[PDB]
Amino acid sequence: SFEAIFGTYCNKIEWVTFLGTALATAAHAIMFHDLNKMTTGKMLFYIQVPRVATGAGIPTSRQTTVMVSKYSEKSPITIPFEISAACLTHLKETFE
Amino acid sequence: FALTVVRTDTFETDTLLYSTKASTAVIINTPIVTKEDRDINTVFHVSQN
Amino acid sequence: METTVLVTFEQRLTTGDVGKLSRLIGAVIPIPYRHHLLGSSQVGLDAVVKDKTRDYSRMRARMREMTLTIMRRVEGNQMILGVPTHGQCYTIRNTGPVSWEKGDVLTTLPPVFSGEVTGLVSVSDWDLVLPWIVPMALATEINQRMMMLALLSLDRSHEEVRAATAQLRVVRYRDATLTLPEITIDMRNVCISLSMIANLSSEVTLAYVRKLTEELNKLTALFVMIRQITDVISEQPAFLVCDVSPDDKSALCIYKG
Amino acid sequence: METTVLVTFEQRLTTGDVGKLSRLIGAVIPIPYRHHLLGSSQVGLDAVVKDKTRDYSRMRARMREMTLTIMRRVEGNQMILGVPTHGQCYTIRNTGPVSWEKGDVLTTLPPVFSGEVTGLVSVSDWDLVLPWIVPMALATEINQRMMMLALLSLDRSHEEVRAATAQLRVVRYRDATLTLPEITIDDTVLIDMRNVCISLSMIANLSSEVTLAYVRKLALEDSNMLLMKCQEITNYNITPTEELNKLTALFVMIRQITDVISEQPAFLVCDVSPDDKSALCIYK
Amino acid sequence: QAITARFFVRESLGEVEQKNLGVLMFRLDTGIEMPSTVLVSLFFLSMVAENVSAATKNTLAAIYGREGEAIRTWLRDGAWRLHRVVHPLGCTNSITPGATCLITCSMRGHSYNMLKTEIYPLLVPKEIYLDLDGESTDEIRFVYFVITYDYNSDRQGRPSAFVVVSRITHRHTLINVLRYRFRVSRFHFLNNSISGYGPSTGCLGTLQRLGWFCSRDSRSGIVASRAGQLSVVKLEKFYVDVGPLVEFA
Amino acid sequence: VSTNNPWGSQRGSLGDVIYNTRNREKLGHNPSFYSPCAQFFTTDDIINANKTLFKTVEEYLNRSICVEGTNSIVEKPCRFLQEA
DSSP: OOOSOOOOOOOOOOOOOSTTSGGGGGEEEEEOSOOSSSOSOEEEEEEEOOOOOOOSSOOOSSSOEEEEEEEOOOOOEEEEEEOOHHHHHHHHHOOO | OOOOOOOOOOOOOOOOOOOOSSSEEEEEOOOEEEEOSOOSSOEEEEEEO | OOEEEEEBOSSOOOHHHHHHHHHGGGOEEEESOOOSOOBTTTSSGGGTTTOTTOOHHHHHHHHHHSEEEEEEEEETTEEEEEEOOTTOEEEEEOOSSSOOOTTOEEEEEOOOOSSOOOOOSOOSSOOOOOOEEEEHHHHHHHHHHHHHHHHHGGGGGSHHHHHHHHHHSEEEETTEEEEOOOOOOHHHHHHHHHHHHHHHHTTSSHHHHTTOOHHHHHHHHHHHHHHHHHTTTOOOOOEEEEEEOGGGSEEEEEEOO | OOSEEEEEOSSOOOHHHHHHHHHHTTSEEEESSOOSEEETTTSSSTTTTTOSSOOHHHHHHHHHHOEEEEOOOOBTTEEEEEOOOSSOOEEEEOOSSSOOOTTSBEEEEOOOOSSOOOSSOOBTTBOOOOOEEEEHHHHHHHHHHHHHHHHGGGTSOHHHHHHHHHHHTBOOSTTOOOBOOSOOOOHHHHHHHHHHHHHHHHHHHHSOHHHHHHHHTTTTTOOOHHHHHHHHOOOSOOOHHHHHHHHHHHHHHHHHHHHTSOOOOOOEEEEEOTTSSEEEEEOO | OOEEEEEEOOTTTSTTTTTSOOOEEEEEEOSOSTTOEEEEEHHHHHTTSTTSOHHHHHHHHHHHHHHIIIIIHIIIIISOOOSSSOEEEEEEEOOOOSSSOEEEEEEEEEOBOGGGSOBOOEEEEHHHHGGGOOSOOOSOOEEEEEEEOOOOSSSSOOOOEEEEEESOOOHHHHHHHHHHHOHHHHHHHHHHHTTOSSSOOOOSEEEEEEEEOOOSSOEEEEEEETTEEEEEEEETTOEEOOOOOEEEO | OOOSOHHHHSSSSIIIIISSHHHHHHHOOOSSOOOTTHHHHSSHHHHHHHHHHHHHHHHHHHHOOOOSSGGGGTTTTTTTTSOO
16 A cells, blocks of 8 residues: 655756757758768858849849859767667567 | 046946858768776767767 | 867968878877867867977977877878877877887877977968877986076086086987977076975974974975876876887877876 | 775664755775675775774874775665776865865875764664875874874873863964864883884984084074064084985985875875865876 | 787797797897897796796706807896886797797787697796795785896995785885885895995885786696706786886885 | 156056066966956956957958957957957
């Protein structure tokens, strides 16, 4: 039998998505499988400039396309993750 | 004598941080799991570059 | 595989500097702290050789207190620095003038431009002066010759100890030699400490020999100088080579503390 | 020998006790035997913090003969004391009452000796008092003043020794005020104080006359704020190789006389948590 | 996980070791400029240490002190010993019956034959080993190498060395238990220390960690080769950890 | 007006050497005893702030991306040499 009742509480942590945040409209997410081959953080931008087509005597000297290079900025997310394998062996078991 | 006496005070400041739409593009690595040799607290270092 | 700290460059990169870094893939890096941020102002012994008042004892103590790291790769403006861990077998590079033999105990010292100046990839008042990576007993003997330069250097006014400092002046090791800087206020305070030990050793234990607040004042001014002079001796050797790559560019080592 | 210790308490741990074990599971324990399985009476040096003669000299000497662990895993009553493999990075919570000066060698402190605190909980008249992890310079100071406040007693009156300990046994440092343990006049202090006397009598000759007169003829030249207190507290040779052997022998004497009052280096800290409660540490 | 390193050993220094593996090997940039870089056996430094009595000393000098009295002990016996010149690196692997001896000395770990069939013991000779032991030991006795002089005449007089095996891990307690039985050495050490007024000597002793071993399978024994027998002590599962050269006086 | 006091004119004064770290480290000082006028009575944090600020402004206007000149926001008027 029992004598003393026992009511406690174990809240669930709110799942927050980066790509579903208001922070995500500052970002442009692109995910890879691996990053080994394309490693060098050069990123070119082939930037077009619109031509002002007035009759000022001169046009733009080209249909000018400027390739501006940029350097990447890496950052690792390294987080520890502990799971008790002494109870994960019961996921291994699942016996009857 | 006069004196000018100087005061380094320090401010816990909350800041605004505005961006454009596609200001910085991120490329996210696959969430690579890092497993070491089995010690009792079998930690995984789960990481992405 | 290991801990890995990134450097961002404020400078617009020179392709020749990127080529020199890609030569120096295997190098070793002086770093203040293993926060994952590193700025170019933080990275390098530039942060040591910027106060020209300061001298070799504090150079060595900064290289003791600051993290010894291994260059791994360069990715655009970022630099990958893998922080070594005690017990693993790592490829490092000989940036100092001293050649390396196999099995040798390997030890960090700051480089000295007294006759053997060797600049680097420096741009915009920041150099990447890497520490001399030098044998253990040779490192201790470098510091011993430095402290005796700062001791004997006061008697430049006499021809005799002037000749003794000029006779010292020089450290010769296997197949690679170097001169040594003259101190005529770090080494000055170091030898203030040494001279207090030297004076008070004939002054404070004479009534202890016969048995074995004034005394606390004297032995306090003895022992704190003793601590400050002992702290800059134990060379804390960083590496221990298994095999040396020939022409002495690199060496596969095991890392110590 | 052994790297992952399982420790059973034979005494009684309750809900509050299994809560309070979590913070100590950051911390550090010395083991007497380095077995996989050890008794909780042996685990820690709390077995001989109740030495009734109660000398920091023997607290010191036994932690010199000990070997540290890192506590882990509040599961049941069992304690995973990972014996730290040398040169690996581990989280360590603090009970030493300092922010550890991030970037330094953090070291073992035998019994605090400013009060007898109960470390974990007092069950079955046994607490778990750990060595408190205070930095290397603070430990070197804390053994320095240990030897000093008995060094005065050999040639001065013991009442004057008491009146000078009344100043110099309270260590002045930021968040590090400690009271030295009513300093033990002891043979343990004697056997190393005689060697301090030996080293000073030897540096009385390993001292060059140049090394004597460096301060004494630099004070004739100019001034320095050490050098004034150093004023207070043909003629020379041309043999620098023998002076190098003098400096070599003198360095051996001063490192010996420093390791008199300079105990073992321990944890070199990777990352202290921003609340200054947990420290990733290498280099035991 | 163990780190090993192939080393140039002379084929006139590969012996002993080559008969029965297990030795310490020290390196040194010595005085003659043509063969400056030399690696060294523990039996080869035994003929420099005074603690090996002159019969056993000249016994292994009759083994390979031909090379010793060629140039090398004229650089170690004759040219006076420093602890600086010699540095311990561990126990030999790869016996190497080749043209030039290329012995792959270990750095850290239990010195092993490859394939994990045989464990290499450390052969520490008898007179350099025993006399600084502490108590009766259980499974993880630590090995320390200590050079200890004694001041007699030539500002040092005589070099000598020891291999102290002790459970006492700590530096200062270990140098105090050295100071227990080395009172005589510090008597005459103080004597020529106060003899040197301007000239100098160089201090008494130098301690360093070498590792640990199984130490309940520890036993003494003997080897035998050219120039006869050699009573030694066999340290079975000798983990290697070369520590720092820590001097005392 | 040129200066406000001729000790504040030149070196050899109570600020320009004694609150300066050069003659202060001749006279000995402390880790944590920060002096709030030392940041200006040293020439060091004058010259370093000016060089970092000028090169970061010049690389803002070479573009017309750059960071590490943004470090003055922590020490913001005290890298502006203005005595906040």
